[PDB]
Write a protein that binds this DNA or RNA. Structure first.
Lengths: 796, 840
DNA sequence: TCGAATCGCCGC
RNA sequence: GCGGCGAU
DNA sequence: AATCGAATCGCCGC
RNA sequence: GCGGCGAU
DNA sequence: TCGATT
């Protein structure tokens, strides 16, 4: 409960070390060096404070046991107590966990009787709950709402209701409780400051390894290796080029040779940003007046809404704390001529900025940041500057000439917002408001100062659906590629609309020729009550959906979740929560007499429509999932029981050269309590669930890294705004980046059959029995990749 | 249906007529006369457009029968329909054979209700498919809906608790949805006799309406019947049209009503001095002339024509003459923040119960829209008159004599309106002006329960905050966080001016001084109550006296005593439940903590006549129910027992604190009851003394007559809206609140004339007990308002005068029932002159 | 058996 | 009249 | 048969 | 682990 | 729901 201050020695050395200073000072100046090292020391300093505040709230709460510093002693203390309870003789392990947590919590916030009463009272409460959970299928319906509850008091209150319903349907001493705790303590005594020092020492250590990362005031330290990049000073937490769950998976990158990967990261780190002072000036004012600046600009349904408004209030507090941090960071570096961001990678190869305040943030955070080195905008830069503004306004589904026309027709509004941003709220109403306001300021400058006016604003181009774009390129899918604007097109293609149009074709077919409605008797298991129930035929079901009107908004989420592995089942939950339930609360949905029947009907229709719109996407993710299932399985001779092939990790190499290992590992045994917080084999399921998204994310990351090196080497582009598939640069450089991103993607998939390369990596790993099971590669389609270079709306 | 425009000829007269023009031109010149008469013309123009939009919506919704142009004709036709209904029923019964198919359906609905349901639904159908079938269907489904759910209304005792929740819902579908839910609930309880309604089939409902349509053509004849393509089986149709004369009657009445409903605006010249009952304020001879007294009958207005009240007339004209201007600095701030927030000062960032929660969000959504529409009007009017060097507000009086401004934008409004308005004619502020300028700023911030020396201390300590708010009101939100933000911000600007320009600075800001509890103050003055007078700051006190904190103190004293002594809990059978004792109940309340918050509303409602019963509903809704929703109120295990217990304690605390108030309102209530009764000898039955109204005259010379009148008959439908003798209960309910309000009106009127004649004061901000003037004249207004109050209650015994008015009217049986005048107390009125915190 | 301040604006 | 807003 | 299940990264909270 | 928020 | 483990 007494924490040493890491600051005085461990944080002092970071600034103190001469070798970082002398190296930093020569290139960037002594004062810029000192500030960078002072800043890095401050980041570690802030992190120590953050842990101290969290620990303090945990002492008052008694949730010290939940804190990571009190975890390691409990793990060595617990097994000896469980055996002692058996030797002295609810599950034995759970009682041992309950006693340790209650003892540590009671001491944190001292009578022996009071702790014994608490342990017994919690023990009785848990067993009354545990029996319902340990029945279990009914508890599974309860468990999701139990997981949604917050705090033991709400858990017990929710537990209380489910027990009463469970009694109604029929699934079914104070001194002794104090005596139960006393004997638990008596066994615990058989199983102190020295233990308290262990949590106290660990608390210091965890305070030293969790800094609040901050932007660099000098160009970041280039990555020459696996660790030590980004920030210049030797720290307690050295940056890793790849964020790894294990130190082993970090080390497999130590040997590997990835010259192009390193260049891409170093180039991105080199990009110099500055705070957009004009946008910051606006944001500082509207923030003092509104919780969210753009949230509200003047211009049985009850029970569902009640759950949302509690969430909506909790959401509103969660948004503000993020805002107040970003704003302070924006104010703090507002005067600096330039700031930089260090970059590392996730284990799949996507590029992330390391500091908490980064160009990859929300719209306000994005609008608060701009590049520091501009070039005169010229004719083409103005053209792309206007296109970006239309995109920020939400005009992104029309051809480019209509996007320019929208800007010119709204020129006076744009000018008004630039002149008096607090007097005209039109910018706040646009889809990406603060980024739009930033565009307004530059648009005014070009009008005030002409095409020679210097512009450093980041103009971001985003691929429409990167995963489907990449999957269609791999397998040459024309129909899917056209739906994602990979092919050159007269008009912007909406994949959500195409799916919706195909759904309407099925809807019309089933309404004319459909299964008739059928009636089946149903008997409730508990009641034993026989009620006649109607299964809706496809004809009746289509009629309800046709009455509602099926738009792109019905099919939108199902297409987005496709890359994440969602399929027909997950769609039915989406349709219910997205369109069917919200219509009911609005009073619409009179046609949706049975919601779940409509959602199941719709989810089948969306899945059929998606599978014919993008065949390569669906085919590829099935092929990858089959591969992961085979490798992840352990092969055992049935008679022998010995394993012929152990569970195998899945590994591949991106065209950039980045390798990735996907090792999802599940623990052997875990303990979870209903009323108290719950306390190395490869998981085959997570291997299958993740192989399709992780592989395609690995491909988009290589595309990004290839684009930034190609843009810097073929063209002069030195400033990059990168969000995983969004590519930004200054307007003078904007047209070349648009070219470079098309040239990179065309180059790789003309050069590399990524799926065949994947097959060569695991083909030997398959057991003799497994080879017949593995599906063949999906057939290539009719698409020509050269047409991607001509496409306007691919944006990538 | 279609209404000719009033505007072209009749609104044209307002600017044309020479005598209104010349009278205005002689006082203020031709050109100000041009602007005023065109402005008054626009006020009539805006008002007519208001009627036309409402009529268009009501026509679209079929709610034309709800509109006032259609009420007179419906009142004429309704008896004819009803008589024909009753005769049809008697004629159908007399004839032998199978009864007509509508006969049974028409019977369960009252003959009055069918009559109105047909007229409204036919008028709705015709003004918004003229076929008899669709209108007969539309009638029939409405009859059934009144039949099915009416059964719930008349049963009746349960309906009284569902009546309010039905009213709180807007729109027929929501009303119908709620009634299906209660019907299912009461059927489960078996209240409705267990008879679930069997829905009428469609062919029945058609036949129900046709019999109704036929019955109006015989009796009333507004609708007439026409047959298209007779004898052709395919196209044989019958149609319905409205009688043109009846359509012309609503159209004539619609136009007549649109020309008499103006949207009153401020004056660009000083308002017309009042010389008589009518035609004051605005200068044009208008279709709706202003009245000096706003009355419900022309007769109550006519009583004022004869009366000589020179001081009443002087006070209104002085108040009208006060020159105002729009505070541009405040208006600049309000124009900005309003565009960003629905209520600009609402959410500043700073560092069964579920069913009740749902009702709260519904009300909150209503309150947001209704609040914002008022805001948008005030800002638009403010921006309109922003560039004028001065503007003026006409004034008139309610039937009790309280003074109100006439234009919709007026200084007697909310904070934002009050903040947007400042006086036009200012004087150099001076030392004394600065002092009250800071006191006013302290009160706008909410530092009002404290002596003046610390009010000055608060302002001077927050000097840098006040300065920052004035320099950048948009950059520092501290002013918006105050209790009266825009009025505080208005002080911030003048405070910044005094520091920039010194004590020579010309300040025209209205410094409002408000009596703490004007009703109890007046009642304490009449009967000379020392204890009551001290509690409401009538007598000089060491500190400001909070009557809520006083009552809370006396409540807490009982609670502590009832925690040591007092009844134990007992079990009582109820048609066995525990009845909590005062000892248990005291413990619950002490656990909650009883503050001035628990007692505030009860003291406020005292002047309105509320007593121990009304406090229990207040206590439950104000503190107990919110506590339960918040997760407090575990102590309130039985909420109604706690509320009734606390209501008793508040009533005992209040009655011993302000005795003069309780005694005086009782005496007036007893007077109105005796006067409002009819006196009839029981054996003969003849009425010896008729029901009599209540009349008195203020010391200012204002007469006032209380004649609450009850209508003989009324009608009420569940889903469609419903459409003279003295009301004795309203006479007793109203006499005491109205009498004390007539006194504060006289005090206000006597104050403005005394401040105008003894001192030089020419600018008055007046809200019924709030007295405002420029800072240079603040000290004298403080003097003047005290001097008037001491003078009247030394010169006049208002209760004794009141008794002299009605003593002759009392009957001989009633004289023993009448209480004596309440005894005067030991208070000395001259202490009011030295009372700092009376403010009045 | 019943009941338990005035004035305006907006909506129905 | 009912629903909501505001003034005292 | 029984039965389970139905993307990555970051911040805040427990 | 759970919950909430944001990025793609 | 149809695949997946079990």
């Amino acid at each position: 409960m007494n924490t040493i201050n890491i600051a005085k020695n461990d944080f002092s050395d970071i600034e103190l070390a001469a070798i970082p200073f002398n190296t930093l000072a020569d290139h960037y100046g002594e004062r810029l060096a000192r500030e960078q090292l002072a800043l890095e020391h401050e980041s570690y300093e802030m992190g120590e404070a953050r842990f101290r505040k969290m620990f303090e709230r945990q002492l008052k709460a008694g949730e010290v046991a939940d804190n990571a510093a009190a975890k390691p002693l409990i793990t060595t203390l617990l097994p000896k107590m469980i055996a002692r309870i058996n030797d002295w003789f609810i599950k034995p392990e759970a009682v041992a966990y309950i006693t340790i947590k209650t003892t540590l919590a009671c001491l944190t916030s001292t009578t022996v009787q009071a702790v014994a009463s608490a342990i017994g009272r919690a023990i009785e409460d848990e067993a009354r709950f545990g029996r319902i959970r340990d029945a279990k299928h009914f508890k599974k319906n309860v468990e999701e709402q139990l997981n949604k509850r917050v705090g033991h008091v709400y858990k017990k209150a929710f537990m209380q209701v489910v027990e009463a319903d469970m009694l109604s349907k029929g699934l079914l001493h104070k001194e002794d409780s104090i005596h139960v705790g006393v004997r638990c303590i008596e066994m615990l005594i058989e199983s102190a400051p020295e233990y308290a020092e262990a949590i106290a020492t660990r608390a210091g250590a965890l305070a030293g390894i969790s800094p609040m990362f901050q932007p660099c005031v000098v160009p970041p330290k280039p990555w020459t290796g696996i660790t030590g990049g980004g920030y210049w000073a030797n720290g307690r937490r050295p940056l890793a080029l790849v964020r790894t769950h294990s130190k082993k998976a970090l080390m497999r990158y130590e040997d590997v040779y990835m010259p192009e990967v390193y260049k891409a990261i170093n180039i991105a780190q080199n990009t110099a940003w500055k705070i957009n002072k004009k946008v910051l000036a606006v944001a500082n004012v509207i923030t003092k007046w509104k919780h969210c600046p753009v949230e509200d600009i003047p211009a049985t349904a009850w029970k569902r809404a009640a759950a949302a408004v509690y969430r909506k209030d909790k959401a509103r507090k969660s948004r503000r704390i993020s805002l107040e941090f970003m704003l302070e960071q924006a104010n703090k570096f507002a005067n600096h001529k330039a700031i930089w961001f260090p970059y590392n990678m996730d284990w799949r190869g996507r590029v992330y900025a390391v500091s908490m305040f980064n160009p990859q943030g929300n719209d306000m955070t994005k609008g608060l940041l701009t590049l520091a080195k501009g070039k005169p905008i010229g004719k083409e830069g103005y053209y792309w500057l206007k296109i970006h503004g239309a995109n920020c306004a939400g005009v992104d589904k029309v051809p480019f000439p209509e996007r320019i026309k929208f800007i010119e027709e709204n020129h006076e509004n744009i000018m008004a917002c630039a002149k008096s941003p607090l007097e005209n709220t039109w910018w706040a109403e646009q889809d990406s408001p603060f980024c739009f306001l930033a565009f307004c300021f530059e648009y005014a400058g070009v009008q005030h100062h002409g095409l020679s006016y210097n512009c450093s604003l980041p103009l971001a181009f985003d691929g429409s659906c990167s995963g489907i774009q990449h999957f269609s390129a791999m397998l040459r899918d024309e129909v899917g590629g056209r739906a994602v604007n990979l092919l050159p097109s007269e008009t912007v293609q909406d994949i959500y609309g195409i799916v919706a149009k195909k759904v309407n074709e099925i809807l019309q077919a089933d309404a004319i020729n459909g299964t008739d409605n059928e009636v089946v008797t149903v008997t409730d298991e508990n009641t034993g009550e026989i009620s006649e129930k109607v299964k809706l035929g496809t004809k009746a079901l289509a009629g309800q959906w046709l009455a509602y009107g099926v738009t792109r908004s019905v099919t939108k989420r199902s297409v987005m979740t496709l890359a994440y592995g969602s399929k027909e089942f997950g769609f039915r939950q989406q349709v219910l929560e997205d369109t069917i339930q919200p219509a009911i609360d609005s009073g619409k949905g009179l046609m949706f007499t049975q919601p779940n029947q409509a959602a199941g009907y719709m989810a089948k229709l969306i899945w059929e429509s998606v599978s014919v719109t993008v065949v390569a996407a669906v085919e590829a993710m099935n092929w990858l999932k089959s591969a992961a299932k085979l490798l992840a399985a352990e092969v055992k001779d049935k008679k022998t029981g010995e394993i012929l092939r152990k569970r195998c990790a899945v590994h591949w190499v991106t065209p950039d050269g980045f390798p990735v290992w996907q090792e999802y590992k599940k623990p052997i045994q875990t303990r979870l309590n209903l009323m108290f917080l719950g306390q190395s084999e490869i998981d085959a399921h997570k291997q299958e669930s993740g192989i399709a998204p992780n592989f395609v994310h690995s491909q988009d990351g290589s595309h990004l890294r290839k684009t930034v090196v190609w843009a810097h080497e073929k063209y002069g582009i030195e400033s990059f705004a990168l969000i995983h598939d969004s590519f930004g640069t200054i307007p003078a450089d904007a047209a070349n980046l648009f070219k470079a991103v098309r040239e990179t993607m065309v180059d790789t998939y003309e050069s590399c059959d990524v799926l065949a390369d994947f097959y060569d990596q695991f083909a030997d790993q398959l057991h003799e029995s497994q080879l017949d099971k593995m599906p063949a590669l999906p057939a290539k389609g009719n698409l020509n990749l050269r047409d991607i270079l001509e496409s306007d709306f691919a944006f990538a």
